[PDB]
Amino acid sequence: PTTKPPTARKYIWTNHKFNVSGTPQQYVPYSTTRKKIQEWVPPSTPYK
Amino acid sequence: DTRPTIRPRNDVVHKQLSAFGQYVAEILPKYVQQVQVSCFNELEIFIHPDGVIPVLTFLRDHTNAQFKSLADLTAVDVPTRQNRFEIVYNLLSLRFNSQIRVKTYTDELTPIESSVTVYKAANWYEREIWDMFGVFFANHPDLRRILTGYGFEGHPFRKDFPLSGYVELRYDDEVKRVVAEPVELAQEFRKFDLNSPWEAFPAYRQPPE
Amino acid sequence: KLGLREIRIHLCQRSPGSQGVRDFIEKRYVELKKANPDLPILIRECSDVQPKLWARYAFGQEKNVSLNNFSADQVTRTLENVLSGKA
Amino acid sequence: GVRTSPTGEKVTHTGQAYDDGDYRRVRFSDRQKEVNENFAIDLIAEQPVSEVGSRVISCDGGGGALGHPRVYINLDKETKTGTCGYCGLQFRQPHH
Amino acid sequence: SNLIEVFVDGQSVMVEPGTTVLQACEKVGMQIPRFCYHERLSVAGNCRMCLVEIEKAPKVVAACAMPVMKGWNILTNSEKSKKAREGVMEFLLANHPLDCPICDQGGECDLQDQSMMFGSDRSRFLEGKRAVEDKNIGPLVKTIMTRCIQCTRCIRFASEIAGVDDLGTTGRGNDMQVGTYIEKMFMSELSGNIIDICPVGALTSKPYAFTARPWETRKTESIDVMDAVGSNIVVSTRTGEVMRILPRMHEDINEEWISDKTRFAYDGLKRQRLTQPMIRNEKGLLTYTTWEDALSRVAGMLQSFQGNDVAAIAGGLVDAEALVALKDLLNRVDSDSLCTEEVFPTAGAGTDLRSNYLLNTTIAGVEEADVILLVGTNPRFEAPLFNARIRKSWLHNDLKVALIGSPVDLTYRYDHLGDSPKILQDIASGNHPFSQILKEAKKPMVVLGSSALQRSDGTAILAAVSNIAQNIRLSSGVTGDWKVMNILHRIASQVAALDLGYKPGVEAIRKNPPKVLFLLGADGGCITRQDLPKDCFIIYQGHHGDVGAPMADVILPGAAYTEKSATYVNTEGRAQQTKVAVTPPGLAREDWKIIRALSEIAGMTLPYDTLDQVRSRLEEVSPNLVRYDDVEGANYFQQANELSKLVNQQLLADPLVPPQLTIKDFYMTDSISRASQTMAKCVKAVTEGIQAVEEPSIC
Amino acid sequence: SPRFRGEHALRRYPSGEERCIACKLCEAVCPAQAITIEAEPRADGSRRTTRYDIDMTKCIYCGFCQEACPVDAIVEGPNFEFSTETHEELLYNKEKLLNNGDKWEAEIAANIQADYLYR
Amino acid sequence: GTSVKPIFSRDMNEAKRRVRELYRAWYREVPNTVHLFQLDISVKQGRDKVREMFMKNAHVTDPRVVDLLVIKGKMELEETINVWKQRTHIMRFFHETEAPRPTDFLSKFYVGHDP
Amino acid sequence: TQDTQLIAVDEKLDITTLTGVPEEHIKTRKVRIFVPARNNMQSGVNNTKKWKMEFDTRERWENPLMGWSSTADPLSNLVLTFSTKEDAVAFAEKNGWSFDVEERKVPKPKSKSYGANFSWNKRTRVSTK
Numbered sequence A: 001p002t003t004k005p006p007t008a009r010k011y012i013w014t015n016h017k018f019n020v021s022g023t024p025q026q027y028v029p030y031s032t033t034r035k036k037i038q039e040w041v042p043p044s045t046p047y048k
Numbered sequence B: 001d002t003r004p005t006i007r008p009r010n011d012v013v014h015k016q017l018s019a020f021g022q023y024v025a026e027i028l029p030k031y032v033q034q035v036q037v038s039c040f041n042e043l044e045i046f047i048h049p050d051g052v053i054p055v056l057t058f059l060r061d062h063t064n065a066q067f068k069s070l071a072d073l074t075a076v077d078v079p080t081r082q083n084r085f086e087i088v089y090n091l092l093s094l095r096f097n098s099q100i101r102v103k104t105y106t107d108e109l110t111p112i113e114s115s116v117t118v119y120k121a122a123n124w125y126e127r128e129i130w131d132m133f134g135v136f137f138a139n140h141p142d143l144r145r146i147l148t149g150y151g152f153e154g155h156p157f158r159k160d161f162p163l164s165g166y167v168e169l170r171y172d173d174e175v176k177r178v179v180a181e182p183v184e185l186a187q188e189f190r191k192f193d194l195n196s197p198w199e200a201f202p203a204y205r206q207p208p209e
Numbered sequence C: 001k002l003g004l005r006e007i008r009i010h011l012c013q014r015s016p017g018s019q020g021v022r023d024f025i026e027k028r029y030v031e032l033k034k035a036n037p038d039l040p041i042l043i044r045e046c047s048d049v050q051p052k053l054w055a056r057y058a059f060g061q062e063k064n065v066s067l068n069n070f071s072a073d074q075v076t077r078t079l080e081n082v083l084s085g086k087a
Numbered sequence D: 001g002v003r004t005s006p007t008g009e010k011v012t013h014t015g016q017a018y019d020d021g022d023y024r025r026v027r028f029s030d031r032q033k034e035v036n037e038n039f040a041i042d043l044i045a046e047q048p049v050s051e052v053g054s055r056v057i058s059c060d061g062g063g064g065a066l067g068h069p070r071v072y073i074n075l076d077k078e079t080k081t082g083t084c085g086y087c088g089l090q091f092r093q094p095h096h
Numbered sequence E: 001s002n003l004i005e006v007f008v009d010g011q012s013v014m015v016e017p018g019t020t021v022l023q024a025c026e027k028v029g030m031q032i033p034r035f036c037y038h039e040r041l042s043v044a045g046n047c048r049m050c051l052v053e054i055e056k057a058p059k060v061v062a063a064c065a066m067p068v069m070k071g072w073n074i075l076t077n078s079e080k081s082k083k084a085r086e087g088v089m090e091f092l093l094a095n096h097p098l099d100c101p102i103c104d105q106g107g108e109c110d111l112q113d114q115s116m117m118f119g120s121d122r123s124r125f126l127e128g129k130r131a132v133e134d135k136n137i138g139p140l141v142k143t144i145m146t147r148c149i150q151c152t153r154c155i156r157f158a159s160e161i162a163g164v165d166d167l168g169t170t171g172r173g174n175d176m177q178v179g180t181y182i183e184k185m186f187m188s189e190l191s192g193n194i195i196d197i198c199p200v201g202a203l204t205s206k207p208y209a210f211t212a213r214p215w216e217t218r219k220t221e222s223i224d225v226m227d228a229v230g231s232n233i234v235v236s237t238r239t240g241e242v243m244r245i246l247p248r249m250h251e252d253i254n255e256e257w258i259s260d261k262t263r264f265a266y267d268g269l270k271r272q273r274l275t276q277p278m279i280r281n282e283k284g285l286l287t288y289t290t291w292e293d294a295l296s297r298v299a300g301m302l303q304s305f306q307g308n309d310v311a312a313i314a315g316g317l318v319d320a321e322a323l324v325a326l327k328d329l330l331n332r333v334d335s336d337s338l339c340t341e342e343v344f345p346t347a348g349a350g351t352d353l354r355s356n357y358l359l360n361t362t363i364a365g366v367e368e369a370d371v372i373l374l375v376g377t378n379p380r381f382e383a384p385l386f387n388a389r390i391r392k393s394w395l396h397n398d399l400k401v402a403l404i405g406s407p408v409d410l411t412y413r414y415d416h417l418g419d420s421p422k423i424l425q426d427i428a429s430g431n432h433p434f435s436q437i438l439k440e441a442k443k444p445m446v447v448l449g450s451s452a453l454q455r456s457d458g459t460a461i462l463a464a465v466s467n468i469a470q471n472i473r474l475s476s477g478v479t480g481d482w483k484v485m486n487i488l489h490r491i492a493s494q495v496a497a498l499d500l501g502y503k504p505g506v507e508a509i510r511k512n513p514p515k516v517l518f519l520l521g522a523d524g525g526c527i528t529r530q531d532l533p534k535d536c537f538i539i540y541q542g543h544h545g546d547v548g549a550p551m552a553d554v555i556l557p558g559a560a561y562t563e564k565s566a567t568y569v570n571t572e573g574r575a576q577q578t579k580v581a582v583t584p585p586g587l588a589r590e591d592w593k594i595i596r597a598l599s600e601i602a603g604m605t606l607p608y609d610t611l612d613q614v615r616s617r618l619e620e621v622s623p624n625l626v627r628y629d630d631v632e633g634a635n636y637f638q639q640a641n642e643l644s645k646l647v648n649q650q651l652l653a654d655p656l657v658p659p660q661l662t663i664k665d666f667y668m669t670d671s672i673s674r675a676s677q678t679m680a681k682c683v684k685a686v687t688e689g690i691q692a693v694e695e696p697s698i699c
Numbered sequence F: 001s002p003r004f005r006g007e008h009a010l011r012r013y014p015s016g017e018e019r020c021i022a023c024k025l026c027e028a029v030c031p032a033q034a035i036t037i038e039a040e041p042r043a044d045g046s047r048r049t050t051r052y053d054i055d056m057t058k059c060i061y062c063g064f065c066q067e068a069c070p071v072d073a074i075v076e077g078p079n080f081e082f083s084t085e086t087h088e089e090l091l092y093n094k095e096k097l098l099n100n101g102d103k104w105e106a107e108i109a110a111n112i113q114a115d116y117l118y119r
Numbered sequence G: 001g002t003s004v005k006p007i008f009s010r011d012m013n014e015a016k017r018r019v020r021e022l023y024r025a026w027y028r029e030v031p032n033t034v035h036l037f038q039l040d041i042s043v044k045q046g047r048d049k050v051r052e053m054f055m056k057n058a059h060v061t062d063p064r065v066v067d068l069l070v071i072k073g074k075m076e077l078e079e080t081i082n083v084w085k086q087r088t089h090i091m092r093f094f095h096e097t098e099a100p101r102p103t104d105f106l107s108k109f110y111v112g113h114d115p
Numbered sequence H: 001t002q003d004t005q006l007i008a009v010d011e012k013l014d015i016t017t018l019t020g021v022p023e024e025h026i027k028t029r030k031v032r033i034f035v036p037a038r039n040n041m042q043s044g045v046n047n048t049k050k051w052k053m054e055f056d057t058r059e060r061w062e063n064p065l066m067g068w069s070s071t072a073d074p075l076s077n078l079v080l081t082f083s084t085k086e087d088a089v090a091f092a093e094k095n096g097w098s099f100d101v102e103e104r105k106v107p108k109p110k111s112k113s114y115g116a117n118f119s120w121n122k123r124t125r126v127s128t129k
């Protein structure tokens, strides 16, 4: 890389991270999509 | 060459296979129902189930056939037919440098004379056919499950048997022993219907009913 | 309580077994309705069905008088028999 | 950029963020909720709108074979700009 | 005797004279590739892919338009035809945009598939492709006009099946573009169908735009319940979610089309849903609660209160299984006030004779009639598919329609006979000139909309039209099998509800105020808490909480029409069934199982316990509710007519005004439609101008 | 070798916007069905995935995804040392994969730069 | 059509005969099998489980079918005799780990949409 | 025409006890015999020529993890193809499955004439081409 450094772009990280498994920096899988069914909101009015 | 992509086709092999197909057909008209040579020079002999043993014996022992090696013995499950199972034999003749295909048919409840007598290689192939599909073979020495786990229910390769199966396995700590439970997939197998609604090959256009 | 709530007639459109009820309904049905306008006589017909009569009584009860091959006079005599009892 | 949720959790570019009453949050405790910071929705906006004196253009995302398939955008509606579907770069006819 | 004989690929085929080459090839089974030729629409010839070689003929003929004659050997797979197909497709793919990864038609694109089968494997077009500016035609139709191939299928559909002439082709040469010139939304009840006919991704659906791929969705057949036509649809579900409702083919009910309210309404099924039982707390606020507590509270009030103090206003979206389950439950409580929101005249025969409330002449029978008479209805919005059938019969058979309601746009051209109800009596007496027309017509047809019966004078109108049918029935100009009187319904659960024996209308509730009223899917708001006696127990069993939810105490989450295997009966009498596309959300259960479980808790356990059992019970109440896809023809019109002669109700001076006169109020009808988001954009679009509906729509 | 198949990553254009346009070719051709994709119209117009999950314990690392991709969005990076202590850490979603694209970009860019001519 | 060649048995009588000694061959070794495999369960619940498995297959009224289960049970006996099935395979017959699925309609309605 | 110790086996084929299917998936499942309709997006007909067998759908929830569409019904993706209704309806009860059958929908032949596009009298004359 000293002779030929790779092309530089904004999104490329500026600090490499080693295997973060085990340490409290792991990757926890989770849903990346929002909810699907919108529950009907009951009316707070005391009705009648 | 004018066909740099199309696979070349041999007619001499086609004629030799066709001539032998007529030869076997005349020799045993009692079982040979129909015979055909595929486009890529492969011969298929359609026998009646009772002719499983006599036809194989003739191909194994005749001086003009000498098919002395059972390459494999498998069946294709086609539910739309009355006899869904379709047992297929593949033999190779070392002396004459040719291969033959002998295929029968069988429903669920019908035993087939095991070819262990003619080809001792069939012995283990027979167990696979019974285990995967359920076709029972009479006179088989040690007919039992070969591939599926002990106490397995059903026959997997049957088209009506679900791919994921009915039962999964898990180590249950309460009994301190690996146990069986009904299947519960974390992600269901996303079936893909990817058959184009446009006709592919006009050559095999089945005539309308 | 078993007071008459509804009478259901199931008849086939063209079956000879249900021919008799057809003879009844073209003639006597109108007069029956004038007699009991409040009564919901149901004539939900069908094809290839055995001509039967359902009579729904109060508290959810149902009789299953079957007028198979009954003639028009027979069908009428079965009807007044069912509604003879007001309860 | 990244917007924090009222419950105190980073919201992904897809808009995903666990509700305050959502039980499926204990996973993130003593760990970190993986989220990217370079929100592609934002970064594409900073790209200048190219101006070319032609009714139609050809965009391939640059790099030839390394880009997206070549498409042709019709820069005829002077009301707004034409953006390539694959990459999002805009184009505009300068006063036609 | 007229059948001329042709040789499709040599094999002899018997063809009716005038048959096109394409249909003759289809007789053997070979399907000639085509783009412009759609079976329902006219034949154009712009496709040029239907080209085929006729034996001993030097010119390749267009199979989409050439009528065969004696002794023709249509060489479908001849070399000359194959060269022609490759050449035509090469021209099509010459200027097509490279949008396959971003085009919704990807995976089900005729251009894609026909390229795989009849087309080359590369391109020799080393030029610059063309690009065409997009057009906006509404918040429903994705328009990427650069992908269009100018097959003019959309133009033909708009001018034939829709009736509105706003889609056309402007300019000549390669620069020719299909659109609407001046910016204007292409809005009609059948607008969304242009998505289906378009063979490419030029016209696609905005609500579903690039949310799924055709090879990954599971297609489940079902029956639409938004309207009373009961159009057959194919609900596509992936990973337990509903993306598309595609039309099916029936050739009688919906042909190959569906209404927009049928198509773009799945979004309603994912918004404002009832998923858990609700019981009011000490402050009268409906809070989440278990099923057992909800069933216990309802059961206790049902056991203590009996007689006629228990009622049930069944909605318009319910199924036959739920209707009979509630009927059996309240019958065991002696309650006979099973009511429906729709008000059908009970005077006379009423629900007794099945012929009284039906489209006896069937939907397909419209294409056979010669004179129709619509009374106080707007079929363009009450039953869009029925209106399309009327137009289809209007176009070909030259059938003459006639309207007595308010003058509204019906795509085709009618002859208004005035909107006064008294016109009906004039036709009965023969004073009106149209009465003579009905005598000469060989197959007259009279259609009375169910919306007209909603008026206070519904009985009088029904008696009037029945007299119209009687007057022309006495004249021998009508055949014996021809059923003249026809009633067109609007809500789905009306023929089934009236077939079961439910009292049409809601008058019994107000005339005998109950206190355990059962709101089964009721959302028309016909009954409020005021008309009910004080301290009324209201049980709502709907799926969307819109109107019937707030005015209740024991909300019971139900199953939507895509979440149950129901039995819906269309306005023509056909009793079709739906299939479970996806299970109900949350804790919501099937409607009939809810009532059966409720009866078990209350003590009066119902006999049936499975779907087959309740369907068998449905057969006992009405045998025609099991004969699926079979129109059980009714009869005894004279007996119904004689009963209507009894009693006397007089007409009124209020003109017959349909509830829906224009497009804007066609959209917002039912609970699912009301809760829909994509439908709100439509009503927003038609109300104001085009400027209020547009998005950066690219993929 | 530059053709080495390892940990997956989604790359982005030099502008910054992602390359994936959610054509689902990678999901359709995945032999083990390890790819799950959910798409939705983005706020700005041109729309990308809202869920792009790769099951790295179900992946066979065949590389069919990077061939099918018409925009070179999903690639198999040079890393092969992403072993983890827990099974859940393997089940990558869009965020982790996008992070990989922003981490191994300096290496993946050169690899395809040396191998694109062969393909 | 109504006639097809049989497996082993020509009618129900000999088919039932082949069931009886199969049950005999299953009764005798159950205490031996329990001893062999260190079964937690006692002998008694072993014997009726053989009885119950034989009992559930009672509606069969076809000689060819009964032969198939008869030969299939023979392999199951063979697998058990020569220690081919371990404790887990034997305990598979006793469905222990899974909770009892209730049979009343009310409970099914409470738990899910299962018909 | 086969003397192989032939006996009278009139009773219907009941192979259900051999296929290994658990008791639950053998009664409470209602299979459907139908000819699939053409994908309305397309116009080809090569997918509406074989009878299909499918099982009614069941619960499909979402995982507590990233949230795929989980399931617990093995007979969810099983789709079988039959060349004739009689073969299809025979495979159902032979395997012991309650079935409902929908008859094949054949697109009725429609007479189409190009000359009608330009008609002297009839309203079928088009206004554009």
Ligand code: SF4
Pocket: E096, E097, E098, E099, E100, E101, E103, E104, E105, E106, E107, E109, E110, E111, E112, E147, E199, E200, E201, E202
């Ligand atoms: S319409 Fe879509 S799928 Fe068809 S060729 Fe054009 S871009 Fe490809």
Ligand code: SF4
Pocket: E147, E148, E149, E150, E151, E152, E153, E154, E155, E178, E197, E198, E199, E200, E202, E203
């Ligand atoms: S928009 Fe579609 S239907 Fe209309 S002409 Fe173009 S390709 Fe044909």
Ligand code: SF4
Pocket: F026, F029, F030, F031, F032, F033, F034, F035, F054, F058, F059, F060, F061, F062, F063, F064, F065, F066
């Ligand atoms: S490399 Fe892995 S993710 Fe890519 S297609 Fe193959 S199995 Fe699927």
Ligand code: SF4
Pocket: F019, F020, F021, F022, F023, F024, F025, F026, F027, F037, F065, F068, F069, F070, F071, F072, F073, F074
């Ligand atoms: S193949 Fe590439 S562009 Fe297509 S969905 Fe997969 S990652 Fe996105």
Ligand code: FES
Pocket: E033, E034, E035, E036, E037, E044, E045, E046, E047, E048, E049, E050, E051, E062, E063, E064, E065
């Ligand atoms: S099909 Fe005849 S030209 Fe398109």
Ligand SMILES: [K+]
Pocket: E105, E195, E196, E197, E198, E199, E200, E201, E202, E203, E204, H041
């Ligand atoms: K389309």
Ligand SMILES: [Zn+2]
Pocket: D059, D060, D061, D068, D084, D085, D086, D087, D088, D089
């Ligand atoms: Zn671009």
